Design a protein around this ligand. Structure first.
Ligand code: G4S
Ligand code: CA
Length: 487
């Protein structure tokens, strides 16, 4: 049995610049402030992806990962928590559609749910031992998708409906009182052994993952580990292991705490890489590093710089269709298959992870209930072909997040070659950016290139109708907002 182990190491709310590893053309101030030596170690042994995309919010990205569908299709287009409860902020002008706020599942029977065959279920069915560690956030509370075991994971460390965490601190029981009562729906479950200890949640998850990997080695099976950090999500607890030195770099209390979440996430990566090396698994293990959306840039309560700049040189952040919200740090290591110290700037979307992971696992034939929108990036990894040649990428956010900002709320977009069109459902406004010429999306070229705006509007409208995508409605009329090619 020559099949590789696979680790998908997913960070929460980590931006393109939330690392010491430069994904841009030079080092930023952020690359010089943050410390991720194990990300640099991973890049030295693998391939960096400098144009990797997600959706701008946890739920659409993670539902796209586990089902291999574009967010416009699965309609989980804002964050989930409570059953049958839209998290959208009310708007004066527009109503959000009746979107899939219960999330995803593998089974029929529940309203407002997208049903899809899990790639993790296919891995398990093929004989992989499957481990979930950390943030799940696939289904609302009291829906079958809330439980990682529903997805085909045999082991669950700390995964549930919630896409946040009540506390990073062992001394606060990760959000339980002294009686063990949860302080909120975000309380982190299954870490009772660490309650009352000076163990940061990132460290506890790593220690539990390593226990599960020691078990995995005894089982005589290839393993799949989804190492899904709760870091670096708010609230910004400080990790006292790392905090003092960021204050000496002149960072604010919040920004120094943020840096400590990054460094602890990087220590977790390093601890798993160390385990692979010591256990003799490193030569037959794939590591995929990814983040689920851009760095938080729209909440002055948590972030201290000029708002909407926390992913500079990218514009905006979490919740935005601008690069700051959707462009993610991504690395793939696969010893003897992927060239070490390589870079790939060809674009891809999170749903592409689904067929790629099954291909890595040698699963050449599989049945799914849903169409798979993902396209394998195996040819990018092997440097053989660009599977995204002439490919359009699509985003749909007919929703209202908790914050306003540049490229946030009630919009959809298409990326094709150098060009990105963003359409605002409420106003009919169209922004056109040349991403390589203008990576900060500061120069709207829509008036200068009406033929490009027309071509991309048709592509965007056609795609959204093809996948039965949703749009907001105008409160005044009850009529849906026009598709971009109806303008
Ligand atoms: O899941 S996330 O999408 O990352 O985060 C959700 C949302 O945007 C955040 O504004 C909130 O604070 O936490 C939610 C947890 O689910
Ligand atoms: Ca997130």
């Amino acid at each position: 049995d020559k099949r590789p182990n696979i680790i998908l190491f997913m960070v929460d709310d980590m931006g393109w610049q939330d690392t010491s590893l430069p994904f841009w053309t030079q080092k930023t101030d952020y690359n010089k402030l943050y410390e991720t030596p194990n990300m640099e170690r991973l890049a030295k042994q693998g391939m960096m992806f400098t144009q990797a995309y997600a959706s701008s919010i946890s739920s659409p990205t993670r539902c796209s990962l586990i089902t291999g569908t574009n967010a416009a299709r699965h309609r989980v287009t804002n964050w989930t928590l409570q059953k049958n409860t839209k998290t959208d902020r009310k708007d004066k002008v527009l109503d959000v559609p009746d979107w899939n706020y219960n999330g995803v599942s593998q089974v029929p029977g529940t309203n407002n749910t997208f049903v899809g065959t899990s790639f993790v279920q296919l891995l398990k069915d093929s004989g992989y031992h499957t481990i979930h560690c950390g943030k799940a956030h696939f289904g609302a509370i009291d829906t079958p998708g809330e439980d990682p075991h529903h997805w085909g994971f045999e082991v669950n460390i700390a995964g549930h409906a919630a896409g946040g965490l009540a506390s990073y601190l062992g001394e606060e029981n990760y959000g339980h009182n002294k009686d063990g009562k949860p302080i909120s729906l975000m309380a982190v479950p299954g870490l009772e052994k660490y309650w009352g200890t000076e163990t940061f949640v990132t460290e506890a998850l790593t220690l539990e993952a390593i226990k599960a990997l020691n078990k995995a080695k005894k089982y005589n099976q290839p393993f799949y580990l989804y190492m899904s950090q709760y870091a670096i999500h708010v609230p910004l607890d400080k990790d006292k292991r790392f905090y003092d030195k960021y204050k000496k770099k002149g960072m604010t209390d919040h920004e120094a705490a943020y840096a400590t979440l990054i460094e602890g996430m990087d220590k977790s990566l390093g601890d798993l890489m160390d385990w692979l090396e010591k256990s003799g698994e490193a030569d037959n293990t794939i590591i995929i590093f990814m983040s689920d959306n851009g760095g938080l840039a729209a909440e002055s309560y948590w972030r201290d710089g000029k708002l909407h700049t926390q992913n500079h040189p990218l514009n905006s952040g979490k919740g935005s269709t601008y690069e700051g919200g959707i462009r993610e740090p991504m690395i793939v290591s696969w010893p003897g298959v992927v060239a070490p110290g390589s870079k790939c700037n060809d674009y891809l979307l999170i749903e592409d992870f689904y067929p790629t992971i099954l291909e890595m696992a040698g699963i050449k034939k599989y049945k799914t209930v849903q169409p798979i929108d993902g396209i394998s990036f195996m040819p990018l990894l092997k440097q053989t072909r660009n599977p995204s040649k002439g490919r359009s990428l699509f985003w749909n956010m007919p929703n209202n997040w908790g914050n306003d900002g540049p490229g946030i709320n009630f919009n959809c977009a298409v990326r094709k070659g150098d060009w990105k069109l963003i359409y605002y459902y409420g106003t009919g406004k169209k922004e056109l950016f040349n991403i390589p010429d203008d990576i900060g999306e500061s120069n709207d070229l829509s008036a200068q290139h009406p033929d490009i705006v027309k071509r991309l509007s048709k592509e965007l409208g056609t795609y959204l109708r093809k996948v039965d995508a949703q749009r907001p409605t105008v409160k005044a009329t009850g009529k849906p907002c026009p598709w971009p090619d109806e303008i």
